[PDB]
Scaffold this active site. Structure first.
Site, PDB file in Angstrom:
ATOM      1  N   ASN A  85       0.802  -1.231   0.000  1.00 19.05           N
ATOM      2  CA  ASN A  85       0.000   0.000   0.000  1.00 19.05           C
ATOM      3  C   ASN A  85       0.841   1.291   0.000  1.00 19.05           C
ATOM      4  O   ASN A  85       0.281   2.379   0.150  1.00 19.05           O
ATOM      5  CB  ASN A  85      -0.951   0.002   1.199  1.00 19.05           C
ATOM      6  CG  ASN A  85      -1.853  -1.200   1.248  1.00 19.05           C
ATOM      7  OD1 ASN A  85      -2.035  -1.815   2.303  1.00 19.05           O
ATOM      8  ND2 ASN A  85      -2.429  -1.567   0.097  1.00 19.05           N
ATOM      9  N   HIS A 137       3.060   2.299   2.220  1.00 19.01           N
ATOM     10  CA  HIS A 137       3.226   2.765   3.583  1.00 19.01           C
ATOM     11  C   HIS A 137       4.478   2.069   4.122  1.00 19.01           C
ATOM     12  O   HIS A 137       4.753   0.923   3.746  1.00 19.01           O
ATOM     13  CB  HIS A 137       1.997   2.380   4.446  1.00 19.01           C
ATOM     14  CG  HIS A 137       0.825   3.295   4.257  1.00 19.01           C
ATOM     15  ND1 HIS A 137       0.514   4.259   5.186  1.00 19.01           N
ATOM     16  CD2 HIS A 137      -0.032   3.402   3.212  1.00 19.01           C
ATOM     17  CE1 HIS A 137      -0.520   4.924   4.690  1.00 19.01           C
ATOM     18  NE2 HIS A 137      -0.878   4.455   3.498  1.00 19.01           N
ATOM     19  N   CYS A 180       5.937   7.422   9.400  1.00 17.42           N
ATOM     20  CA  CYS A 180       6.999   8.103   8.670  1.00 17.42           C
ATOM     21  C   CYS A 180       6.371   8.244   7.271  1.00 17.42           C
ATOM     22  O   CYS A 180       6.094   7.246   6.614  1.00 17.42           O
ATOM     23  CB  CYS A 180       8.269   7.253   8.643  1.00 17.42           C
ATOM     24  SG  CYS A 180       9.508   7.761   7.408  1.00 17.42           S
TER      25      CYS A 180
END
Ligand SMILES: Cc1cccc(C(=O)N2CCC(C(N)=O)CC2)c1
Ligand SMILES: Cc1cccc(C(=O)N2CCC(C(N)=O)CC2)c1
EC number: 3.1.2.14
Lengths: 263, 264
Positions: free
Chosen positions: A185, A187, A222
């Site tokens: 995804n 991430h 992050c």
């Protein structure tokens, strides 16, 4: 891998790989964390999912709030480890996923883990309590009576973690993710944060100690172009307090604690 | 995993993991490279090792000089891939390890790889030709007749790679390994260099193209406290790039390579 007889938990066996081990020829804690994630994904897939039907319509996702891992023996390169996983509802707060790691030959428990998950809107990033419709849809895949990987009263998995105060005793600055650190995804993988936390532990400690316990709180992700500073201070076996924060403004992304045993 | 009937090659099956895939839900090239390494290690272990008895006495090791990978289809998350591997002697120059990747359900070849290995003294880091004693010790584990993953006459795996000239079109600076990037011997894993090369390819190319071919030359290793700069320049429905990894400080070359991408 397969669901157990009652359909309320999932088991899977893994052969520890050559690139998954550290200097002692045993799996690193990041390899263990990756295997926990893999068996969790395979459990969600086996029962039809871990977003439910109602979650997809409302654009809701599960996000990790806390991860707690205790390792008694790290499996060696070539060893087979069996991991059992299951989930439980924690009322309106969210959900919990637990794991038990066993040596496939001896059948002995070599580790245990627990994680707390909260519901969040994927777009606004705002947290939300669990509704009746979401549970019920989720509850038919969970044991109804409590089943805890960490049952003990006043166990380490529920300890409050303080914020590290400047100056830090040790640090590793300017840590940045590469594409291998991202999930499907786009991430940053949760296991990367475990690696970044460990980056500020001195090499001498890694060479002479084994990591016994790690507790990590996840506060913020992050995001694109973010750079992370990893800070550690000894609080003591050896215990450490950890803090991950953005390099620029000092915004907190994670806090945690580690406990190490002399080899 | 297991040695084949004749004992001259090794096969192993792998189920692609959730964290091993990219945005397309298919294995990344780094996952493929990690699986090639794992099946190579399991082959060396099955036949008694990949340092031989004479190599350990003389403090000699095999090191990768070149890696060449071609992927036709990346396996999806949950798919089973079967990888066959074998080694061949290349006279006194060194050895070669080849791989064939197949879809376990269809049996079709979905990729192939080849790598050139040279002997080196572990301590001084000096390269050396393969002696008769070493050669005889590993020849009993190799096919005697040539067996090539890349047989074709003018194939991409043997192309000479030029050095990228400044200024680079694209770059990613200050790349540094973390502990997860190290192998059991506290050396940077060869697959990390593949990731670092790919770091300077723009995200737009990654989003719209699939990596078809990668050729990487290994010149020097990233040692304790070294920081790396990744440089890329387009050389070209296909896009080709020239790559260079060098130390951030003095500009010492560590790797050079080329990639070929095809539009999705
Ligand atoms: C999508 C996302 C989410 C979170 C962080 C990043 C990021 O900052 N990267 C990773 C990849 C990037 C690259 N193009 O090599 C270099 C830095 C990207
Ligand atoms: C042994 C070795 C070989 C090659 C490079 C490194 C290195 O530069 N590291 C990796 C780990 C390190 C740490 N202590 O977190 C931070 C930088 C170390």
């Amino acid at each position: 891998g397969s669901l157990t007889e009652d359909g309320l938990s999932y088991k899977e066996k893994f052969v520890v790989r050559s690139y998954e081990v550290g200097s002692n020829k045993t799996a690193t804690v990041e390899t263990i964390a990756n295997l926990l994630q893999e068996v969790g994904c395979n459990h969600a897939q086996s029962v039809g999912f871990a977003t439910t039907t109602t979650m997809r319509k409302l654009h809701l996702i599960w996000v990790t709030a806390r991860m707690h891992i205790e390792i008694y023996k790290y499996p060696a390169w070539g060893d087979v480890v069996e991991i059992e996983t299951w989930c439980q509802s924690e009322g309106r707060i969210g959900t919990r996923r637990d794991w038990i790691l066993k040596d496939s030959v001896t059948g002995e428990v070599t580790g245990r883990a627990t994680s707390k998950w909260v519901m969040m809107n994927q777009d606004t990033r705002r947290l939300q309590k669990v509704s009746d419709d979401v549970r019920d849809e989720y509850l038919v895949f969970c044991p109804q009576e409590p089943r805890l990987a960490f049952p003990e009263e006043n166990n380490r998995s529920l300890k409050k973690i303080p914020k590290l105060e400047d100056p830090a005793q040790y640090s590793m600055i300017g840590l940045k993710p590469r594409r291998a650190d991202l999930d499907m995804n786009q991430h940053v993988n949760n296991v990367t944060y475990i690696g970044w936390v460990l980056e500020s532990i001195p090499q001498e400690i890694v060479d002479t100690h084994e990591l016994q316990v790690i507790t990590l709180d996840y506060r913020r992700e992050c995001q694109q172009d973010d750079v992370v500073d990893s800070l550690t201070t000894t609080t003591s076996d050896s215990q450490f307090l950890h803090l991950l924060r953005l390099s620029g403004d000092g915004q907190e992304i994670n806090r945690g604690t580690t406990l190490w045993r002399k080899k």
